[PDB]
Amino acid sequence: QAAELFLDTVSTFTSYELMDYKTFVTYTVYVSMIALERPDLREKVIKGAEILEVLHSLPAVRQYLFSLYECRYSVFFQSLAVVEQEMKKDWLFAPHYRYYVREMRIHAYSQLLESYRSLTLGYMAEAFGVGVEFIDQELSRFIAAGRLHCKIDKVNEIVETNRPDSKNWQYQETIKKGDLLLNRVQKLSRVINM
Protein backbone atom coordinates (compact mmCIF):
# COMPACT_ATOMS: atom_id res chain seq x y z
CA GLN A 1 0.00 0.00 0.00
CA ALA A 2 3.11 2.20 0.86
CA ALA A 3 4.92 1.34 -2.46
CA GLU A 4 1.99 3.07 -4.31
CA LEU A 5 2.61 6.23 -2.42
CA PHE A 6 6.45 5.93 -2.42
CA LEU A 7 6.66 5.68 -6.20
CA ASP A 8 5.14 9.25 -6.44
CA THR A 9 7.70 12.06 -6.81
CA VAL A 10 5.65 15.03 -8.30
CA SER A 11 6.06 16.54 -4.74
CA THR A 12 9.93 16.83 -4.81
CA PHE A 13 9.68 19.02 -1.67
CA THR A 14 7.39 19.86 1.17
CA SER A 15 7.02 22.65 3.75
CA TYR A 16 9.68 20.61 5.64
CA GLU A 17 7.90 20.04 8.94
CA LEU A 18 5.80 17.26 7.52
CA MET A 19 8.91 15.24 6.69
CA ASP A 20 12.33 16.26 5.19
CA TYR A 21 13.79 16.05 1.74
CA LYS A 22 16.95 14.13 2.52
CA THR A 23 15.19 11.61 4.60
CA PHE A 24 12.35 11.13 1.98
CA VAL A 25 14.82 10.42 -0.98
CA THR A 26 16.79 7.94 1.26
CA TYR A 27 13.47 6.32 2.38
CA THR A 28 12.07 5.74 -1.15
CA VAL A 29 15.11 3.79 -2.27
CA TYR A 30 15.19 1.68 0.83
CA VAL A 31 11.69 0.68 0.45
CA SER A 32 12.48 -0.07 -3.26
CA MET A 33 14.95 -2.90 -2.65
CA ILE A 34 12.63 -4.82 -0.32
CA ALA A 35 9.34 -4.12 -1.91
CA LEU A 36 10.16 -4.53 -5.56
CA GLU A 37 11.83 -6.99 -7.91
CA ARG A 38 13.78 -6.41 -11.13
CA PRO A 39 11.25 -5.72 -13.90
CA ASP A 40 9.91 -2.98 -11.57
CA LEU A 41 13.38 -1.59 -10.73
CA ARG A 42 14.54 -1.23 -14.37
CA GLU A 43 11.34 0.48 -15.23
CA LYS A 44 10.75 2.86 -12.25
CA VAL A 45 13.89 3.46 -10.32
CA ILE A 46 15.70 4.96 -13.25
CA LYS A 47 14.10 8.26 -12.37
CA GLY A 48 17.27 10.17 -13.12
CA ALA A 49 17.30 13.05 -10.68
CA GLU A 50 16.67 10.71 -7.87
CA ILE A 51 19.76 8.55 -8.85
CA LEU A 52 22.03 11.62 -8.48
CA GLU A 53 20.86 12.17 -4.93
CA VAL A 54 21.73 8.58 -3.75
CA LEU A 55 25.23 9.14 -5.03
CA HIS A 56 25.27 12.41 -3.13
CA SER A 57 24.93 10.14 -0.08
CA LEU A 58 25.53 6.77 1.33
CA PRO A 59 25.14 3.68 -0.80
CA ALA A 60 21.98 2.24 -2.27
CA VAL A 61 22.22 3.14 -5.94
CA ARG A 62 25.57 1.53 -5.42
CA GLN A 63 25.72 -1.68 -3.43
CA TYR A 64 22.11 -2.69 -3.10
CA LEU A 65 21.08 -1.78 -6.60
CA PHE A 66 24.04 -3.58 -8.30
CA SER A 67 23.53 -6.67 -6.18
CA LEU A 68 19.75 -6.83 -7.13
CA TYR A 69 20.36 -6.47 -10.82
CA GLU A 70 23.35 -8.91 -10.74
CA CYS A 71 21.25 -11.40 -8.61
CA ARG A 72 24.29 -12.48 -6.71
CA TYR A 73 24.57 -13.56 -3.03
CA SER A 74 28.35 -13.51 -3.60
CA VAL A 75 28.96 -9.96 -2.67
CA PHE A 76 26.04 -8.54 -0.71
CA PHE A 77 27.17 -9.28 2.86
CA GLN A 78 28.80 -5.88 3.04
CA SER A 79 25.39 -4.45 2.91
CA LEU A 80 24.36 -6.40 5.99
CA ALA A 81 26.09 -3.46 7.72
CA VAL A 82 23.31 -1.08 6.46
CA VAL A 83 20.54 -2.91 8.42
CA GLU A 84 22.45 -2.22 11.55
CA GLN A 85 23.21 1.37 10.58
CA GLU A 86 19.83 2.78 9.49
CA MET A 87 17.26 0.71 11.41
CA LYS A 88 18.76 1.12 14.77
CA LYS A 89 19.16 4.91 14.58
CA ASP A 90 15.56 5.30 13.28
CA TRP A 91 12.33 5.27 15.18
CA LEU A 92 10.32 4.40 12.04
CA PHE A 93 12.34 1.51 10.75
CA ALA A 94 13.50 0.19 14.15
CA PRO A 95 10.19 -1.61 15.04
CA HIS A 96 10.78 -3.83 11.89
CA TYR A 97 14.01 -5.63 12.86
CA ARG A 98 14.61 -9.19 11.60
CA TYR A 99 11.61 -9.26 9.39
CA TYR A 100 13.02 -6.51 7.17
CA VAL A 101 16.56 -8.02 6.96
CA ARG A 102 15.52 -11.63 6.67
CA GLU A 103 13.00 -10.96 3.81
CA MET A 104 15.75 -9.10 1.92
CA ARG A 105 18.30 -11.91 2.33
CA ILE A 106 15.76 -14.45 1.12
CA HIS A 107 14.96 -12.28 -1.93
CA ALA A 108 18.47 -12.21 -3.16
CA TYR A 109 19.02 -15.94 -2.55
CA SER A 110 15.76 -16.95 -4.38
CA GLN A 111 16.95 -15.29 -7.70
CA LEU A 112 20.24 -17.13 -7.59
CA LEU A 113 18.45 -20.48 -6.85
CA GLU A 114 15.97 -19.86 -9.73
CA SER A 115 18.79 -19.40 -12.26
CA TYR A 116 20.14 -23.01 -12.04
CA ARG A 117 17.79 -25.93 -11.76
CA SER A 118 20.56 -28.24 -10.63
CA LEU A 119 22.55 -26.00 -8.25
CA THR A 120 25.75 -26.74 -6.57
CA LEU A 121 25.29 -25.93 -2.74
CA GLY A 122 28.92 -26.62 -2.50
CA TYR A 123 30.31 -24.00 -4.80
CA MET A 124 28.19 -21.37 -3.01
CA ALA A 125 29.01 -22.45 0.45
CA GLU A 126 32.81 -22.01 -0.05
CA ALA A 127 33.12 -19.01 -2.36
CA PHE A 128 30.35 -16.95 -0.89
CA GLY A 129 32.56 -17.21 2.30
CA VAL A 130 29.90 -18.53 4.46
CA GLY A 131 29.57 -21.41 7.02
CA VAL A 132 28.25 -24.55 5.45
CA GLU A 133 26.11 -25.12 8.50
CA PHE A 134 24.68 -21.48 8.42
CA ILE A 135 23.54 -21.49 4.71
CA ASP A 136 21.80 -24.84 4.99
CA GLN A 137 20.14 -24.33 8.34
CA GLU A 138 18.70 -21.05 7.26
CA LEU A 139 17.81 -22.60 3.89
CA SER A 140 15.82 -25.38 5.61
CA ARG A 141 14.20 -22.54 7.65
CA PHE A 142 13.16 -20.89 4.41
CA ILE A 143 11.93 -24.13 2.66
CA ALA A 144 9.69 -24.89 5.68
CA ALA A 145 8.00 -21.56 5.18
CA GLY A 146 6.95 -22.42 1.66
CA ARG A 147 9.00 -19.34 0.56
CA LEU A 148 11.55 -21.49 -1.22
CA HIS A 149 10.90 -24.92 -2.70
CA CYS A 150 14.42 -26.14 -3.13
CA LYS A 151 14.52 -29.89 -2.63
CA ILE A 152 17.67 -30.76 -0.76
CA ASP A 153 19.48 -33.87 0.49
CA LYS A 154 21.97 -32.37 2.94
CA VAL A 155 24.87 -34.91 2.96
CA ASN A 156 25.37 -34.33 -0.69
CA GLU A 157 26.10 -30.90 -2.04
CA ILE A 158 23.37 -30.94 -4.72
CA VAL A 159 20.01 -29.27 -4.80
CA GLU A 160 17.13 -29.44 -7.24
CA THR A 161 13.99 -27.49 -7.79
CA ASN A 162 10.26 -28.24 -8.49
CA ARG A 163 7.26 -26.15 -9.48
CA PRO A 164 6.70 -23.47 -6.69
CA ASP A 165 3.62 -22.24 -8.70
CA SER A 166 1.17 -24.99 -9.21
CA LYS A 167 -2.55 -25.56 -9.11
CA ASN A 168 -2.20 -27.41 -5.84
CA TRP A 169 -0.21 -24.53 -4.27
CA GLN A 170 -2.71 -21.88 -5.43
CA TYR A 171 -5.71 -23.72 -3.99
CA GLN A 172 -3.78 -24.03 -0.62
CA GLU A 173 -3.29 -20.27 -0.34
CA THR A 174 -6.95 -19.67 -1.12
CA ILE A 175 -8.04 -21.90 1.75
CA LYS A 176 -5.33 -20.40 3.84
CA LYS A 177 -6.87 -16.82 3.72
CA GLY A 178 -10.37 -18.41 3.95
CA ASP A 179 -9.54 -19.86 7.39
CA LEU A 180 -8.69 -16.46 8.90
CA LEU A 181 -11.95 -15.08 7.78
CA LEU A 182 -13.91 -17.94 9.29
CA ASN A 183 -12.79 -16.86 12.77
CA ARG A 184 -14.22 -13.34 12.18
CA VAL A 185 -17.57 -14.88 11.52
CA GLN A 186 -17.56 -16.56 14.90
CA LYS A 187 -16.61 -13.32 16.67
CA LEU A 188 -19.68 -11.67 15.06
CA SER A 189 -21.77 -14.66 16.20
CA ARG A 190 -20.48 -14.21 19.67
CA VAL A 191 -21.57 -10.59 20.21
CA ILE A 192 -24.91 -10.90 18.50
CA ASN A 193 -27.36 -13.94 19.01
CA MET A 194 -28.43 -12.85 22.39
Partner: peptide, 21 residues
Protein backbone atom coordinates in the same frame (compact mmCIF):
# COMPACT_ATOMS: atom_id res chain seq x y z
CA UNK B 1 14.33 -9.85 16.74
CA UNK B 2 16.97 -7.41 17.30
CA UNK B 3 19.26 -10.18 18.72
CA UNK B 4 19.13 -12.17 15.39
CA UNK B 5 20.27 -9.06 13.33
CA UNK B 6 23.42 -8.73 15.49
CA UNK B 7 23.74 -12.59 15.49
CA UNK B 8 23.55 -13.05 11.76
CA UNK B 9 25.83 -10.14 11.18
CA UNK B 10 28.73 -11.39 13.46
CA UNK B 11 28.52 -14.77 11.81
CA UNK B 12 28.17 -13.43 8.15
CA UNK B 13 30.27 -10.31 8.28
CA UNK B 14 33.18 -11.44 10.29
CA UNK B 15 34.92 -14.29 8.20
CA UNK B 16 36.81 -17.22 9.50
CA UNK B 17 35.77 -19.28 6.49
CA UNK B 18 37.03 -16.99 3.60
CA UNK B 19 40.27 -16.47 5.67
CA UNK B 20 40.84 -20.27 6.02
CA UNK B 21 40.66 -20.44 2.20
Amino acid sequence: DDFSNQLRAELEKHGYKMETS
